[PDB]
């Protein structure tokens, strides 16, 4: 019932020395330990399962079927995630999908539509994401229009905190896993787009390794 860290990241976030995961995003630190999100993100995080798809092998002695679980995670004002797990037992499939969805969590930013008033509500620019043949487009919308899409990017954008979108899907949309991965790749390219906002040459702060090496030289070996 008590979490024991393995890597230095878990020890640094457990010894109340790392303030938040914002500088973990800033320094692009590879997250691989599951409950960093559980220590940082509080009770606002919720979860819901998209689809369960059975896949079958073929053998001389019958066929073997294993569950494939798709899950979508994220608090309603903040970040998102996605997890694909394949196992024979459905409960282990859901548990592994939950763990992988807590692992792959990306930060997103929101812009305005025309007027720069209040809190941001929509995507800053036209972003896109592709995998297979699925092509998911995102267009910014005025405030209060609501997201106009299929039900699964509707629930993804409601756990993304973005209230206004316009979509344009192409290709075979009937594969739900590929479509979910395509809109996840579309929402993951929000920060990978240069704007005149981010034309400032940023300053360099102290790295967590460079400031906590005096602690981790004696904490664990």
């Amino acid at each position: 019932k008590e979490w024991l860290p393995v890597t230095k990241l878990g020890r640094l976030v457990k010894d109340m020395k790392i303030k938040s995961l914002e500088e973990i995003y800033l320094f692009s630190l590879p997250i691989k330990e599951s409950e960093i999100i559980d220590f940082f993100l509080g009770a606002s995080l919720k979860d819901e399962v998209l689809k369960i798809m059975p896949v079958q092998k073929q053998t001389r002695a019958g066929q073997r079927t294993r569950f494939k679980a798709f899950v979508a995670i994220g608090d309603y004002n903040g970040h998102v995630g996605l997890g694909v797990k394949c196992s024979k037992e459905v409960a282990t499939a859901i548990r592994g999908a939950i763990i992988l969805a807590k692992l792959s969590i990306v930060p997103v930013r929101r812009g305005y539509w025309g007027n720069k008033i209040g809190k941001p509500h929509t995507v800053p620019c036209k972003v896109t994401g592709r995998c297979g043949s699925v092509l998911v487009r995102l267009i910014p919308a005025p405030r209060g229009t609501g997201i106009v899409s299929a039900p699964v990017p509707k629930k993804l954008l409601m756990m993304a905190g973005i209230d206004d979108c316009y979509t344009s899907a192409r290709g075979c949309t009937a594969t739900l896993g590929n479509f979910a991965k395509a809109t996840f790749d579309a929402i993951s390219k929000t920060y990978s787009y240069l704007t005149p906002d981010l034309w400032k040459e940023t300053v360099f702060t102290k790295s967590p390794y460079q400031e906590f090496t005096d602690h981790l030289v004696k904490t664990h070996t």
Binding site: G114, N115, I117, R143, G144
Partner: protein
């Protein structure tokens, strides 16, 4: 060749998806909260709000320092103020898009009678509108689909032809008194 009008429009619209959980549950929550008869009323209010939002978007797609855009935006702002849904603190064209369907449904006469303390229940308020009991500015209203304007809110009272606010007693009281007097004599 006849002297006829032939000017009719559809006020309610139907959504494309017939069966989805979120819209049906939210519309049912609105119906239960505000005492609506059916989903046609909330569809009508949603269509009016959508028309107002479309007019607001068609005004924000025009530039500033234009007389037509300024006149239409000012007139829309005065109308939205005068129907009592908005406050005078934030009176600008960009705040028109930040309105909800409960904001429009709060200015309904049924919810107003329920919230003024002159009615006990929401369904009782709807009955009291339909039972021809109250009046506004010496004029009775029998229709719950009424938008109460801001300058006429303190002039709501029971009608003079109603037994609740002073008038002739109803049919049940005289029938019961006549039955009791016939039984006694």
């Amino acid at each position: 060749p006849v002297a006829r009008s032939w000017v009719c429009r559809k006020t309610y619209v139907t959504p494309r998806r017939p069966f989805e959980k979120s819209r049906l549950d939210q519309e049912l929550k609105l119906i239960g909260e505000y005492g609506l008869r059916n989903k046609r009323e909330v569809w009508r209010v949603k269509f009016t709000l959508a028309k107002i939002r479309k007019a607001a978007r068609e005004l924000l797609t025009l530039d500033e320092k234009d007389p037509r855009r300024l006149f239409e935006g000012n007139a829309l702002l005065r109308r939205l103020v005068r129907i009592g849904v908005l406050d005078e603190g934030k009176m600008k064209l960009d705040y028109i898009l930040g309105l909800k369907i409960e904001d429009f449904l709060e200015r309904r006469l049924q919810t107003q009678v329920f919230k003024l303390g002159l009615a006990k229940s929401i369904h009782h308020a709807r009955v009291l509108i339909r039972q021809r009991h109250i009046r506004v500015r010496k004029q009775v209203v029998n229709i719950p689909s009424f938008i109460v304007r801001l300058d006429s809110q303190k002039h709501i009272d029971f009608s003079l032809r109603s037994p609740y606010g002073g008038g002739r007693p109803g049919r049940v009281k005289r029938k019961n008194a006549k039955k009791g007097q016939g039984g006694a004599g």
